[PDB]
Design a protein around this ligand. Structure first.
Ligand SMILES: [Ca+2]
Ligand SMILES: [Ca+2]
Ligand SMILES: [Ca+2]
Ligand SMILES: [Cl-]
Ligand SMILES: [Cl-]
Ligand SMILES: [Fe+2]
Length: 684
């Protein structure tokens, strides 16, 4: 009683997926196991589907398989082998066994047939043993490390190439990244020569700086940045749509009166009435107090007491929804502590240059807050903790591992690269931000102390901010598109949960999902001295709770990151629209600003050029990117999971059509939350 096994192996299409190592396969079932059988005839190229017929002991019902690679011979260039799937038919069994993989094969790989399972679901003992062994190994490979006591946990890895191959960039992403860095150096050098002796004379001089870059079009604020309406617009639909809140009373330290702003109001009501009516909005950049900027200045409540010396601010700014539904800037106080030396500036300044300068100070605060808090910390660095916990704690056979895989990809890679090339001394931030030079890390630490997982729940966060009423605050497309996508992701995730978890007891009994959240709770977002609670539960008690955390996480990896990252070309491409460095301290009296003093405070030509270069690198989509819901490289087998995926993709298609229809009637289409433009993950 031998059996004949027909074995088909599908190698992934990605670069270097293939192998010339000698490959064998051991088959285990109810009756025993075969020896390692050779899969020897023909090549294993990328994208190949290769068939083998091997004979051995009849194992009966197949329960697991083991692939072994000899790691190549002397001439083998890249023996590591990326395997999509193995399909086996045994001559003795009236069944097709399907073993999804979608992971790199180094020397040994154990695979199980059929649908995903929770750890307590009934399977052969040998399957449970192998599952436990996988997780033991994961914990050795995937280890916690920390920038400081005040930063979320990251993966331990010296450089990108020290990362497990499963979490490195694909070669296509590495090429996209490395080529972007080369192109940026070339464009910077050519632009430097071209503008070398230019007398930087006017705001329009900065337009030259994006001209020799492939950005996907002229920044859409280039022609309108100087208009108060479009300045206001970007607090809803630009790169940092996260800080504006409804103002139900002026802060005590921001003493704006009806006299300051009455000339801007246009619905027939005074400031107090407009506040009650829900048409008054505010930003408060208080968190920036104490920030250390390059060259040494330290920000105080009052502001500040040839060298590269940079400045920031902690402003408050007031906005008004006018009768046409436009969000208009109506008052700015550049720093926190009000008085004659830190007054209230309005669009009605006697000296028009004073109002423009006030707007630039608001923009510098916004840029440093956006790049470091909204983007780097609150997408990349904080979600990285969850990516790491997924690898540490969820088995590859776990349905939530399968769900998260397409979404967690990239973040470990880019952050590992970034801990050198973006956050590191001399790096991207140091050249392009006021807070570069070291103050940027302290600032992220300060922000992290306040981070709560509830912040990542879009509907709750928009409601908390008072920005979710379209009748009071119209024209807010980040909200509208974000909420549509939140709902689609939440529906999908709930349907997936319902397939594998039949009730709350199933969640409670799932030791892997419990380990997963506890690892983040205890080791990931550590509540350390001086930290607020981080809102990370120590355990899961229900399917609804599991859904809310997964939805928050998936939405952040994909949608949130896209909205605050890929919006950067339009926001920052024309430097005066959004300066990230200022070179002189703020005014201590009114009447000082001239075009010339403004141009000397704004970023230099080369500072501006480096901001553009940075944006170019951080916004480059890889040629192998997969966008939201594209699950072509996922390990699902369950028919009901496949159906839930179908419904999700169809819903995303409907959302995409609705967004395009909405956009065809907009002066400035809002495109960053189209599903075809949202990567599954945070990869750049
Ligand atoms: Ca290879
Ligand atoms: Ca072949
Ligand atoms: Ca399908
Ligand atoms: Cl055998
Ligand atoms: Cl499955
Ligand atoms: Fe990013």
């Amino acid at each position: 009683h031998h059996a004949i096994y027909n074995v088909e192996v599908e190698t992934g299409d990605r670069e270097h997926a293939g192998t010339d190592a000698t490959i064998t396969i051991r088959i285990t079932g109810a009756k025993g196991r075969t020896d390692y059988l050779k899969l020897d005839k023909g090549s294993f190229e990328a994208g190949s589907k290769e068939q083998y017929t091997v004979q051995g002991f009849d194992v009966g019902d197949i329960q697991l398989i083991e692939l072994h690679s000899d790691g190549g011979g002397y001439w083998s260039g890249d023996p590591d082998w990326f395997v999509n799937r193995v399909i086996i038919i045994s001559s003795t069994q009236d069944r097709v066994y399907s073993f999804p993989c979608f992971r790199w094969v180094i020397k040994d790989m154990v695979l199980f047939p059929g649908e995903a399972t929770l750890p307590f679901n009934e399977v052969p003992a040998i399957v449970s043993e192998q599952r436990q062994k996988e997780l033991e190994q994961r914990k050795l490979t995937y280890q916690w490390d920390y920038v400081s006591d005040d930063m979320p946990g990251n993966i331990k890895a010296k450089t990108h190439d020290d990362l497990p191959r499963d979490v490195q960039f694909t070669d296509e992403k590495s090429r996209s990244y490395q080529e972007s860095r080369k192109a940026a150096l070339v464009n910077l050098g050519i632009g430097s020569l071209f503008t070398m002796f230019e007398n930087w004379d006017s705001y329009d001089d900065y337009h030259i700086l994006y001209r020799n870059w492939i950005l996907g079009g002229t920044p859409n604020m280039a022609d309108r940045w100087h208009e108060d309406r479009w300045f206001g617009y970007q607090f809803l639909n630009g790169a940092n749509p996260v800080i504006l809140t409804r103002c139900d009373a002026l802060p005590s330290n921001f003493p704006v009166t009806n006299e300051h702003v009455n000339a801007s109001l246009d619905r027939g009501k005074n400031l107090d009435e407009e506040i009650k009516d829900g048409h008054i909005y505010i930003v408060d950049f208080k968190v920036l107090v104490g920030a250390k900027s390059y060259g040494g200045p330290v920000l105080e409540d009052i502001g500040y007491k040839e060298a590269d010396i940079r400045y920031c601010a902690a402003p408050l700014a007031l906005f008004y929804v006018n009768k046409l539904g436009h969000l208009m800037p109506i008052a700015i106080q550049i720093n926190q502590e009000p008085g004659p030396e830190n007054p209230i500036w309005t669009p009605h300044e006697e000296n028009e240059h004073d109002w423009m300068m006030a707007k630039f100070w608001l923009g510098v605060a916004e840029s440093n807050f956006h790049q470091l808090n909204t983007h780097l910390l609150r997408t990349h660095l904080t979600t990285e903790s969850f990516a790491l916990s997924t690898w540490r704690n969820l088995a590859s056979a776990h349905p939530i591992f399968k769900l998260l895989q397409p979404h967690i990809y990239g973040v470990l890679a880019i952050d590992t690269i970034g801990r050198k090339e973006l956050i590191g001394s001399g790096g991207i931030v140091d050249q392009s931000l006021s807070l570069g030079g070291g103050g940027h890390v302290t600032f992220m630490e300060k922000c992290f102390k306040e981070v709560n997982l509830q912040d990542y729940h879009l509907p709750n966060a928009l409601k908390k901010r008072g920005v979710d009423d379209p009748s009071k605050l119209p024209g807010f497309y980040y909200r509208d598109d974000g909420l549509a996508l939140w709902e689609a992701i939440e529906t999908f995730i709930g349907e997936i949960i319902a397939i594998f978890y039949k009730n709350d007891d199933d969640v409670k009994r799932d030791n892997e999902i419990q380990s997963w959240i506890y690892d983040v709770h205890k080791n990931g977002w550590r509540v350390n001295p001086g930290h607020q609670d981080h809102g990370v539960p120590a355990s899961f008690e229900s399917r609804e709770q599991l859904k809310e955390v997964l939805t928050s996480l998936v939405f952040t990896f994909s949608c949130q990151h896209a909205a605050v990252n890929f919006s950067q070309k339009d926001h920052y491409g024309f430097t005066p629209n959004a300066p990230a460095i200022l070179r002189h301290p703020p005014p201590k009296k009114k009447g000082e600003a001239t075009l010339q003093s403004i141009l000397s405070t704004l970023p230099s030509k080369s500072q501006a050029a480096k901001a553009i270069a940075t944006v170019y690198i951080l916004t480059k989509f890889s040629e192998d990117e997969r966008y939201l819901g594209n699950y072509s490289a996922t390990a699902w087998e369950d028919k009901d999971a496949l159906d839930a995926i179908n419904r999700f993709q169809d819903k995303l298609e409907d959302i995409s059509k609705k967004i395009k229809q909405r956009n065809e009637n907009l002066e400035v289409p809002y495109i960053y939350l189209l599903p075809e433009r949202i990567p599954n993950g945070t990869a750049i």
